[PDB]
Nucleic acid binder design. Structure first.
Ligand SMILES: Nc1ncnc2c1ncn2[C@@H]1O[C@H](COP(=O)(O)CP(=O)(O)OP(=O)(O)O)[C@@H](O)[C@H]1O
Ligand SMILES: [Zn+2]
Ligand SMILES: [Zn+2]
Lengths: 138, 56, 119, 56, 116, 158, 98, 214
DNA sequence: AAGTACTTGAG
RNA sequence: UCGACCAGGA
DNA sequence: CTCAAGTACTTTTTCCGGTCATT
């Protein structure tokens, strides 16, 4: 109960089986392009790629899944800071706009409040885990 | 007819036992699939076949 | 493959070649960190897969009522207590081999009469 | 159905009606027949316009 | 012209196949292995560049399959089986008697598959 | 089939093989990128016997073209059953790659007899890492080993 | 069907508060590589946190609903092969007695 | 020897079909000439090393006595084959000027892989005469010999004129054969030419249709 | 859903 | 006296 | 200046009482 949010998040796996370097992007409400997941994680707070890895893969004895994450880490690598990630949501105007979308329109169930940035990040990773899970045919 | 019924009932039975055989054999990884089919696809044909032979 | 991360900033490690001493190094592009590669293997493909068949064999596997029980005695503890699933690999191509987990030793053994498996 | 254990490929499990109509159907047999029967009404409805447009 | 230079290296392998010649005595020297090197090397020149590529890998399959043992030891002793036919043989036949068991298994069981 | 071969089941088997389109992808188990800095000597002890019967014999100008080459090696294991069933030889496979990439890629391979079937590749002539990953894509998905393009799963019928 | 009903919709906070007080580690403090077997707990498709031994927690809730303290309509599932525990206070679910 | 002979078989296979095409087109070639064997084929056009020379294969054929009765204006044709897989603008002019001086009415050019877009845009440069391009691989098999392909027959200006009279037809009212059509190409069919197609019927025994060119 | 019939865009 | 939805028939 | 992909468009069987709003 609360208007009844029509917003649906799509987490996509670009490229097919046999296509070199498969990237994972996600469509966020009210921002036209589908931005790489590593940028989202950095925009949420998780900045080192390996803390971002730890959010998707819950086992570090699973190289098959991690190898599938390697190109996505490379894609996101252009942006290394949280503020530089919020900016990559098109200054100061595009940064507050970004800040607002992740709170209000990105995963509005769970919470729309504030500091729950971690909760949304683990959830994002859960979705990405369940995505790569059918990609491996597991 | 009564005896005819027993005859029908055991026709099903002998065909269900014929399935069980092909099932536990395919579980024991001994089956060989006829081209353009998985072991699974090839197995399922046999099941369907024994049970349709049976009904008829 | 089993790749490492750059200490100090836990970022991904990228390869670099030390053409002088002809050895592989793992360089960091989020700083000045470097480290000798252990293995000469940098990347692995694996088209034909054998990993995903024994998927989710938690301790509570024997508690699942939705699972079937059999009479097959254990190869190590020798208990006639079983819970078995089909090859958990969700590919069309997959075979219907059974994977029996014992309700005592909690060790997995198959019905396969072709391969000398140890996983 | 939730009345079966997992990885059951047996005639009974994947919808084999061992019974005659005179004898009567088991609840599981009844439900499986019910799914198969519904497929008939759908195909008659789906492919009836497609066939009609073909004539036109 | 430059082929003759390459032909030299070809003989040098059947010369060590001396190190293959050892278990012929251990069940059922460096001089006859030099003579038997020329027994095959010139016989492969016969098989090749006829009337008027192939050759290079032919020598490999002979060395690799004859090196074998203790499965091809049975096929290697029957050699000292003629050394004339062995040249035009190549591949699936030069294989182990233990391998031509699985080769029969695969080929004879796939014949029941693609015959629908 | 040809009129004078109608019932010859063996003639059919030959065509069956001659038309069914086979890609390297179908006979490969896995591909690996190894950093083997010296071409003459291999870090992999399994590939010891491979370099031996290939460097000695294939002495046909392969010294200056090349004595390196590329330190980055692409190594791929093939399946005996896949190779046997879809009738093939390491020599057959190896020469196709060798004629797809011509003299821009140095190809070597293990013999049919060997317990592990392998094909070793090196570039000829900065960022070569990804440059080689592109070479394996053209090798698995763009190479024809046997048969006619667009033709799949061919079956015999009496 | 004759016996089937549709869930009217319950409140998830009295179960959220229950869970945390019964061994639920909050997601805000999850150490994924330290405890990598941990069963993940979802209340109406909201990942709240994880539980170290799902077996005993499960029966606490199962017997808690059967007692009448958890609403009888509130459906809870234990996916052992997936290490997951989903709970539904949701309005719209069709249930049947057994 | 291995895959050397596969190019050879194919070249001879194509030669036979080109022979058949010219024969069926109306020109004078014998079945004894067509059925020319492979071992004999090699003996004539294969070089000192067994490599076939396509320059030698090139030949001229003249109209049969019966052809001159139906279509008298039908002139002799020249068939050339090139040893260059990619046929240049230099070689094409050597062929084009051959027909222009020798006043040939028609000329078939059999190429290996391709012809320069430069060279191929010199075909209508010599009227009244006409040129026809054909790929070797296409000519390996005589498509006209297939089960499903009935006998198409070229109608004379008068045969055609008569057909339209007797069926009270406008040219449009006739079923059409495309210029690009494999059989239309085999018979060097020109826009407006009519073919009498004799097919076999499960109903009449024999039924004959007609097709106007595109 | 599957054509068509175009723009839009890379090499 | 106008046409939209819904529910039905073979 | 070729050709891959994104863009938009147009179809979807036949006949045969009630209730709503508004014309
Ligand atoms: N949606 C539809 N559109 C057009 N025609 C239909 C139709 N539904 C039924 N019909 C007509 O009705 C005929 C058959 O339908 P029914 O008469 O209701 C079955 P039945 O013949 O009484 O018994 P059966 O079910 O044993 O065949 C069809 O062949 C068709 O002519
Ligand atoms: Zn660093
Ligand atoms: Zn045990």
């Amino acid at each position: 109960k609360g208007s009844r949010f029509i917003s649906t998040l799509q987490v996509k796996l670009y490229g097919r089986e046999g296509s070199s370097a498969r990237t994972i992007k996600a469509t966020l409400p009210y921002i036209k392009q589908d931005i790489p997941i590593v940028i989202i994680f950095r925009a949420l707070g998780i900045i080192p790629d390996g803390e971002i890895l730890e959010h998707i893969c819950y086992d570090v004895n699973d190289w098959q899944m991690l190898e599938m994450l390697k190109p996505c880490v490379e894609d996101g690598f252009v942006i290394q800071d949280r503020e530089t990630a919020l900016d990559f949501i098109g200054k100061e105007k595009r940064i507050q706009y970004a800040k607002d979308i992740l709170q209000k329109e990105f995963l509005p169930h769970i919470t729309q409040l504030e500091g729950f940035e971690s909760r949304k990040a683990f959830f994002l990773g859960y979705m990405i885990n369940r995505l790569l899970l059918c990609a491996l045919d597991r | 007819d009564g005896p005819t019924m027993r005859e029908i009932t055991e026709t099903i039975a002998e065909a269900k036992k014929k399935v069980l055989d092909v099932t536990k054999e395919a579980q024991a990884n001994l089956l060989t699939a006829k081209h353009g089919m998985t072991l699974r696809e090839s197995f399922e044909d046999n099941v369907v076949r024994f049970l349709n032979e049976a009904r008829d | 493959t089993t790749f490492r991360f750059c200490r100090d900033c836990n970022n991904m490690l990228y390869p670099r070649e030390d053409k002088e001493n002809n050895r592989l190094l793992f360089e960091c592009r989020t700083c000045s960190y470097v480290e000798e590669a252990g293995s000469p293997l940098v990347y692995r493909h694996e088209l034909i897969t054998n990993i995903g068949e024994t998927a989710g064999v938690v301790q509570d596997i024997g508690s699942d009522p939705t699972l079937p029980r059999s009479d097959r005695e254990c190869p190590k503890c020798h208990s006639r207590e079983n819970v078995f699933f089909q090859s958990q690999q969700r590919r069309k191509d997959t075979s219907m081999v059974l994977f029996f987990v014992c309700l005592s030793c909690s060790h997995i053994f198959t019905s396969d009469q072709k391969n000398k498996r140890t996983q | 159905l939730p009345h079966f254990s997992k990885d059951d490929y047996s005639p009974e499990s994947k919808g084999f009606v061992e019974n005659s109509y005179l004898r009567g159907l088991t609840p599981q047999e009844f439900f499986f027949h019910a799914m198969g029967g519904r497929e008939g009404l759908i195909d008659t409805a789906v492919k009836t316009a497609e066939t009609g447009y073909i004539q036109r | 012209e430059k082929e003759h230079k390459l032909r030299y290296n070809a003989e040098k392998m059947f010369s060590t196949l001396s190190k293959f010649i050892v278990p012929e005595t251990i069940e059922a020297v460096i001089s006859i292995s030099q003579e038997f090197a020329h027994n095959l090397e010139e016989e492969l020149y016969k098989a090749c560049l006829n009337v008027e590529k192939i050759y290079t890998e032919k020598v490999r399959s002979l060395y690799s399959n004859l090196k074998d043992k203790k499965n091809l030891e049975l096929k290697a002793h029957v050699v000292e089986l003629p050394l004339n036919k062995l040249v035009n043989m190549n591949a699936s036949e030069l294989a182990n008697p233990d391998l031509q068991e699985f080769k029969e298994k695969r080929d004879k069981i796939i014949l029941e598959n693609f015959i629908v | 089939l040809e009129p004078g071969h109608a019932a010859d089941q063996e003639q059919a088997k030959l065509i069956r093989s001659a038309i069914e389109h086979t890609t390297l992808k179908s006979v490969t188990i896995a591909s690996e990128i190894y950093y083997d800095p010296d071409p003459r000597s291999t870090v992999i002890p399994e590939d010891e016997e491979i370099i031996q019967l290939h460097f000695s014999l294939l002495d046909e100008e392969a010294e200056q073209s090349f004595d390196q080459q590329s330190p980055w090696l692409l190594r791929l294991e093939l399946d005996r059953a896949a190779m046997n069933d879809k009738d093939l030889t390491m020599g057959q496979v190896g020469e196709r790659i060798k004629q797809t990439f011509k003299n821009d890629l140095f190809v070597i391979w293990s013999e049919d007899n060997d317990e592990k079937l392998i094909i070793r590749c090196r570039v000829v002539r900065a960022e070569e890492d990804h440059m080689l990953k592109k070479i394996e894509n053209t090798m698995l998905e763009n190479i024809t080993l046997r048969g006619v393009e667009n033709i799949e799963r061919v079956v015999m019928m009496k | 069907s004759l016996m089937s009903c549709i869930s009217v919709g319950t409140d998830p906070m009295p179960i959220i508060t229950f869970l945390s007080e019964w061994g639920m580690e909050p997601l805000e403090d999850y150490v994924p590589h330290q405890s990598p077997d941990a069963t993940r707990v979802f209340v109406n498709g909201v990942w709240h946190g994880v539980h170290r031994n799902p077996a005993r927690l499960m029966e606490t809730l199962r017997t808690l609903r059967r007692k009448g303290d958890i609403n009888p309509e509130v459906s809870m599932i234990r996916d052992i092969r997936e290490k997951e525990l989903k709970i539904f206070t949701d309005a719209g679910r069709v249930y049947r007695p057994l | 020897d291995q895959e050397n002979e596969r190019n050879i078989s194919r070249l001879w296979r194509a030669f036979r079909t080109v022979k058949e095409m010219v024969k069926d087109r109306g020109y004078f070639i014998t079945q004894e000439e067509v059925e020319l064997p492979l071992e004999d084929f090699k003996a004539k056009y294969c070089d000192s090393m067994g490599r076939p020379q396509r320059k030698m294969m090139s030949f001229q054929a003249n109209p049969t006595e019966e052809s001159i009765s139906k279509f008298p204006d039908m002139g002799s044709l020249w068939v050339e084959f090139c040893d260059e897989p990619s046929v240049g603008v230099k070689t094409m002019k050597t062929f084009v000027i051959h027909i222009q001086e020798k006043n040939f009415q028609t000329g078939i050019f059999v190429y290996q892989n391709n012809i320069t877009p430069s060279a191929m845009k010199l075909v209508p440069s010599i009227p009244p005469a006409t040129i026809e391009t054909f790929n070797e691989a296409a000519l390996v098999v005589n498509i006209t010999h297939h089960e499903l392909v009935p006998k198409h027959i070229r109608l004379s200006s008068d045969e055609k004129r008569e057909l339209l009279k007797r069926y009270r037809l406008k040219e449009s009212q006739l079923p059409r054969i495309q210029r690009a059509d494999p059989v239309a190409l085999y018979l060097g069919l020109k826009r407006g030419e009519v073919v009498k197609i004799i097919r076999k019927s499960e109903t009449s025994g024999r039924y004959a249709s007609y097709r106007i060119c595109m």
